[PDB]
Amino acid sequence: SLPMQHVHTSPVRDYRNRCARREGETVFQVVVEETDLRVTALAELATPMAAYVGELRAQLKVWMEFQPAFRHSLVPVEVPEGAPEVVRRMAHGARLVGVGPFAAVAGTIAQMVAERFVDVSPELIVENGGDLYLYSERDRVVGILPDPASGDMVGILVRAGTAPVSLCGSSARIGHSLSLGDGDLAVVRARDASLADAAATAFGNMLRRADDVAAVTERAAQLASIGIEGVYAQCGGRIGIWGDMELAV
Ligand code: NA
Ligand code: NA
Protein backbone atom coordinates (compact mmCIF):
# COMPACT_ATOMS: atom_id res chain seq x y z
CA SER A 1 0.00 0.00 0.00
CA LEU A 2 1.06 3.63 -0.54
CA PRO A 3 2.82 5.42 1.08
CA MET A 4 5.83 3.16 1.92
CA GLN A 5 5.95 0.28 -0.49
CA HIS A 6 9.09 -1.44 -1.67
CA VAL A 7 9.44 -0.66 -5.41
CA HIS A 8 11.55 -3.05 -7.49
CA THR A 9 14.76 -1.72 -9.08
CA SER A 10 18.07 -3.09 -10.27
CA PRO A 11 20.59 -1.63 -7.87
CA VAL A 12 23.62 0.55 -8.69
CA ARG A 13 25.20 -0.62 -5.40
CA ASP A 14 24.93 -4.23 -4.24
CA TYR A 15 27.42 -4.91 -1.40
CA ARG A 16 26.37 -8.57 -1.22
CA ASN A 17 29.83 -9.79 -2.22
CA ARG A 18 28.68 -13.36 -3.11
CA CYS A 19 25.08 -13.45 -4.44
CA ALA A 20 25.05 -17.21 -4.39
CA ARG A 21 22.56 -18.73 -1.88
CA ARG A 22 19.81 -16.11 -2.24
CA GLU A 23 18.90 -13.69 -5.05
CA GLY A 24 15.38 -15.12 -4.96
CA GLU A 25 13.24 -12.74 -2.94
CA THR A 26 9.84 -13.88 -1.76
CA VAL A 27 6.92 -11.62 -0.86
CA PHE A 28 4.12 -12.55 1.50
CA GLN A 29 1.49 -11.22 3.79
CA VAL A 30 1.36 -11.62 7.58
CA VAL A 31 -2.08 -10.84 8.94
CA VAL A 32 -3.03 -11.05 12.63
CA GLU A 33 -6.34 -9.44 13.41
CA GLU A 34 -5.76 -5.81 12.44
CA THR A 35 -1.97 -6.01 12.06
CA ASP A 36 -1.32 -6.45 8.39
CA LEU A 37 2.22 -6.83 7.10
CA ARG A 38 3.70 -7.01 3.65
CA VAL A 39 7.11 -8.68 3.78
CA THR A 40 9.97 -9.11 1.34
CA ALA A 41 12.36 -11.81 2.54
CA LEU A 42 14.93 -14.40 1.45
CA ALA A 43 12.97 -17.23 3.04
CA GLU A 44 9.39 -18.16 3.67
CA LEU A 45 8.60 -16.91 7.15
CA ALA A 46 4.88 -16.04 7.16
CA THR A 47 4.10 -18.73 9.74
CA PRO A 48 6.73 -17.93 12.40
CA MET A 49 6.18 -14.22 11.67
CA ALA A 50 2.44 -14.44 12.46
CA ALA A 51 3.23 -16.31 15.69
CA TYR A 52 5.65 -13.52 16.70
CA VAL A 53 3.19 -10.76 15.80
CA GLY A 54 0.46 -12.65 17.73
CA GLU A 55 2.76 -12.58 20.76
CA LEU A 56 3.56 -8.81 20.50
CA ARG A 57 -0.16 -8.17 20.15
CA ALA A 58 -0.96 -10.27 23.30
CA GLN A 59 1.61 -8.28 25.27
CA LEU A 60 0.01 -4.97 24.28
CA LYS A 61 -3.50 -6.24 25.14
CA VAL A 62 -2.23 -7.31 28.61
CA TRP A 63 -0.39 -4.04 29.11
CA MET A 64 -3.54 -2.10 28.16
CA GLU A 65 -5.47 -4.05 30.84
CA PHE A 66 -2.86 -2.97 33.41
CA GLN A 67 -2.32 0.66 32.29
CA PRO A 68 -5.86 1.79 31.15
CA ALA A 69 -4.71 5.26 29.98
CA PHE A 70 -1.98 3.83 27.65
CA ARG A 71 -4.09 3.03 24.53
CA HIS A 72 -5.50 6.56 24.10
CA SER A 73 -2.94 8.79 25.67
CA LEU A 74 -2.05 11.81 23.46
CA VAL A 75 0.97 12.51 25.69
CA PRO A 76 4.02 10.59 26.95
CA VAL A 77 3.39 7.79 29.46
CA GLU A 78 5.80 6.56 32.14
CA VAL A 79 6.53 2.81 32.00
CA PRO A 80 8.58 0.64 34.41
CA GLU A 81 11.66 -1.44 33.51
CA GLY A 82 9.64 -4.64 33.91
CA ALA A 83 7.26 -3.64 31.04
CA PRO A 84 7.33 -5.61 27.72
CA GLU A 85 9.90 -4.61 25.17
CA VAL A 86 7.24 -3.55 22.61
CA VAL A 87 5.66 -1.25 25.27
CA ARG A 88 8.99 0.29 26.33
CA ARG A 89 10.16 1.02 22.76
CA MET A 90 6.87 2.72 21.83
CA ALA A 91 6.85 4.77 25.07
CA HIS A 92 10.47 5.91 24.54
CA GLY A 93 9.89 6.92 20.84
CA ALA A 94 6.76 8.82 21.85
CA ARG A 95 8.56 10.58 24.73
CA LEU A 96 11.25 11.91 22.38
CA VAL A 97 8.73 14.02 20.45
CA GLY A 98 6.07 14.48 23.15
CA VAL A 99 3.20 12.34 21.88
CA GLY A 100 1.40 9.23 23.10
CA PRO A 101 2.84 5.69 22.95
CA PHE A 102 0.31 4.45 20.44
CA ALA A 103 1.66 6.94 17.85
CA ALA A 104 4.60 4.51 17.58
CA VAL A 105 2.81 1.14 17.51
CA ALA A 106 3.10 0.29 13.78
CA GLY A 107 6.76 1.33 13.43
CA THR A 108 7.71 -0.56 16.58
CA ILE A 109 6.04 -3.76 15.37
CA ALA A 110 7.70 -3.53 11.90
CA GLN A 111 11.21 -3.07 13.41
CA MET A 112 10.79 -5.80 16.03
CA VAL A 113 9.49 -8.29 13.49
CA ALA A 114 12.47 -7.35 11.28
CA GLU A 115 15.05 -7.73 14.14
CA ARG A 116 13.71 -11.14 15.07
CA PHE A 117 14.23 -12.56 11.55
CA VAL A 118 17.07 -10.69 9.94
CA ASP A 119 19.47 -13.51 11.07
CA VAL A 120 17.71 -15.92 8.69
CA SER A 121 16.97 -13.30 6.01
CA PRO A 122 19.69 -10.64 5.82
CA GLU A 123 17.58 -9.02 3.06
CA LEU A 124 14.31 -8.18 4.80
CA ILE A 125 11.58 -5.53 4.31
CA VAL A 126 8.65 -5.25 6.71
CA GLU A 127 5.82 -2.97 5.56
CA ASN A 128 3.13 -2.14 8.14
CA GLY A 129 0.69 0.28 6.52
CA GLY A 130 2.54 3.59 6.12
CA ASP A 131 5.48 2.35 8.15
CA LEU A 132 8.39 0.37 6.80
CA TYR A 133 11.52 -1.27 8.30
CA LEU A 134 14.46 -2.27 6.04
CA TYR A 135 17.60 -4.44 6.37
CA SER A 136 19.51 -4.64 3.10
CA GLU A 137 22.97 -4.70 1.46
CA ARG A 138 21.84 -3.22 -1.87
CA ASP A 139 20.17 0.07 -2.89
CA ARG A 140 16.45 -0.09 -2.23
CA VAL A 141 13.67 2.34 -3.24
CA VAL A 142 10.69 2.87 -0.97
CA GLY A 143 7.70 4.33 -2.89
CA ILE A 144 5.95 7.28 -1.24
CA LEU A 145 3.35 8.37 -3.76
CA PRO A 146 2.48 8.24 -7.44
CA ASP A 147 2.86 11.22 -9.74
CA PRO A 148 -0.57 11.20 -11.54
CA ALA A 149 0.71 13.56 -14.26
CA SER A 150 4.01 11.68 -14.94
CA GLY A 151 2.03 8.46 -14.66
CA ASP A 152 4.67 6.85 -12.35
CA MET A 153 6.17 6.29 -8.84
CA VAL A 154 8.06 8.67 -6.54
CA GLY A 155 10.26 7.03 -3.85
CA ILE A 156 13.02 7.48 -1.29
CA LEU A 157 16.42 5.94 -1.97
CA VAL A 158 18.03 3.92 0.79
CA ARG A 159 21.65 3.53 -0.42
CA ALA A 160 23.51 0.23 0.08
CA GLY A 161 25.18 0.16 3.48
CA THR A 162 22.85 2.71 5.20
CA ALA A 163 20.18 0.25 6.39
CA PRO A 164 18.90 -0.88 8.95
CA VAL A 165 16.41 1.98 8.79
CA SER A 166 12.79 3.04 9.21
CA LEU A 167 10.65 5.10 6.85
CA CYS A 168 7.44 6.13 8.54
CA GLY A 169 4.62 8.14 7.02
CA SER A 170 1.89 10.18 8.66
CA SER A 171 -0.88 8.48 6.62
CA ALA A 172 -1.45 4.74 5.87
CA ARG A 173 -3.63 4.86 2.70
CA ILE A 174 -4.03 7.17 -0.37
CA GLY A 175 -6.00 8.83 1.04
CA HIS A 176 -8.10 9.97 -0.65
CA SER A 177 -6.33 13.17 -1.75
CA LEU A 178 -2.82 11.76 -1.41
CA SER A 179 -0.51 12.26 -4.42
CA LEU A 180 2.63 14.28 -5.23
CA GLY A 181 1.85 17.82 -4.02
CA ASP A 182 -1.81 17.06 -3.13
CA GLY A 183 -2.71 16.02 0.46
CA ASP A 184 -0.83 16.32 3.74
CA LEU A 185 2.00 13.91 4.38
CA ALA A 186 5.10 13.73 6.53
CA VAL A 187 7.64 10.94 6.02
CA VAL A 188 10.37 10.44 8.61
CA ARG A 189 13.62 8.45 8.37
CA ALA A 190 15.29 7.12 11.48
CA ARG A 191 17.04 3.98 12.67
CA ASP A 192 14.56 3.72 15.52
CA ALA A 193 11.09 3.07 14.06
CA SER A 194 9.35 4.03 17.34
CA LEU A 195 10.89 7.50 17.00
CA ALA A 196 10.17 7.75 13.24
CA ASP A 197 6.57 6.66 13.70
CA ALA A 198 5.90 8.99 16.70
CA ALA A 199 7.64 11.82 14.81
CA ALA A 200 5.47 11.23 11.72
CA THR A 201 2.45 11.73 13.98
CA ALA A 202 3.85 14.87 15.59
CA PHE A 203 4.82 16.26 12.17
CA GLY A 204 1.49 15.20 10.67
CA ASN A 205 -0.36 17.03 13.44
CA MET A 206 1.60 20.18 12.71
CA LEU A 207 0.77 20.20 8.99
CA ARG A 208 -2.38 22.29 8.66
CA ARG A 209 -1.40 24.78 5.95
CA ALA A 210 1.35 25.40 3.32
CA ASP A 211 3.34 27.57 5.79
CA ASP A 212 3.54 24.61 8.20
CA VAL A 213 5.89 22.69 5.84
CA ALA A 214 8.82 24.95 6.84
CA ALA A 215 7.97 24.42 10.55
CA VAL A 216 8.29 20.65 10.02
CA THR A 217 11.67 20.67 8.15
CA GLU A 218 13.04 23.07 10.73
CA ARG A 219 11.74 20.95 13.61
CA ALA A 220 13.20 17.78 11.98
CA ALA A 221 16.61 19.49 11.77
CA GLN A 222 16.37 20.25 15.50
CA LEU A 223 15.72 16.56 16.14
CA ALA A 224 18.81 15.28 14.26
CA SER A 225 20.74 14.79 17.57
CA ILE A 226 18.05 12.40 18.90
CA GLY A 227 18.04 10.26 15.82
CA ILE A 228 16.05 11.89 12.99
CA GLU A 229 17.92 11.34 9.68
CA GLY A 230 15.52 13.07 7.28
CA VAL A 231 12.05 14.30 6.52
CA TYR A 232 9.79 14.69 3.60
CA ALA A 233 6.83 17.08 4.20
CA GLN A 234 4.01 17.93 1.81
CA CYS A 235 1.03 20.22 2.48
CA GLY A 236 -1.10 22.64 0.45
CA GLY A 237 1.01 22.46 -2.69
CA ARG A 238 4.30 22.95 -0.78
CA ILE A 239 7.05 20.27 -0.55
CA GLY A 240 9.89 20.47 1.91
CA ILE A 241 12.72 18.05 2.38
CA TRP A 242 15.37 17.97 5.09
CA GLY A 243 18.45 15.68 5.58
CA ASP A 244 19.07 12.23 4.12
CA MET A 245 16.17 12.15 1.66
CA GLU A 246 17.08 11.52 -1.95
CA LEU A 247 14.14 10.88 -4.28
CA ALA A 248 14.08 8.32 -7.09
CA VAL A 249 11.51 8.57 -9.90
NA1 NA B 1 2.61 0.92 2.82
NA1 NA C 1 2.68 7.45 14.03
Dist. CA 71–CA 40, nearest whole Å: 30
Query: In angstroms, what is the span from residue 135 Cα to ligand 2's centroid?
Result: 21
DSSP three-state, residue 121: coil
Q: Say which experimental method was used.
A: X-ray
Query: In angstroms, what is the span from residue 131 Cα to ligand 1's centroid?
Result: 6
Query: In angstroms, what is the span from residue 141 Cα to ligand 2's centroid?
Result: 21
Q: Nearest CA to 196 among 111, 86, 71?
A: 111
Dist. CA 221–CA 54, nearest whole Å: 36
Query: In angstroms, what is the span from residue 233 Cα to ligand 2's centroid?
Result: 14
Q: Nearest CA to 64 among 35, 105, 31?
A: 105
Query: In angstroms, what is the span from residue 72 Cα to ligand 1's centroid?
Result: 23
- In the DSSP assignment, the letter for residue 172 is S
- In terms of C-beta density within 10 A (0-12 exposed, 13-18 middle, 19 or more buried), how is residue 33 classed? exposed
All structural domains of the chain, each given as residue ranges with its CATH number in brackets, are: 1-249 (3.10.520.10)
Task: Please answer whether residues 147 and 168 qualify as being in contact, where contact means their C-beta atoms are separated by less than 8 angstroms.
Answer: no
Q: Nearest CA to 184 among 166, 220, 211?
A: 211
β pairing state of 124-128 and 35-41: antiparallel
For 167, phi then psi, to 5°, come to -125, 115
Query: In angstroms, what is the span from residue 18 Cα to ligand 2's centroid?
Result: 37
Helices 193-206 and 212-222: crossing angle in degrees, nearest 10, is 150
Query: In angstroms, what is the span from residue 53 Cα to ligand 2's centroid?
Result: 18
Name every residue whose Cβ is closer than 8 Å to that of residue 242 and which is 6 or more positions away in sequence.
217, 218, 220, 221, 230, 231
For 201, phi then psi, to 5°, come to -70, -50
Q: Nearest CA to 185 among 228, 135, 231, 124?
A: 231
Alpha-carbon torsion angle 40, 12, 248, 193, nearest 10: 40
Handedness of CA 196, 71, 88, 125 (dihedral sign): negative
Instruction: Give the ligand with the smallest distance to the CA of 202.
Output: 2
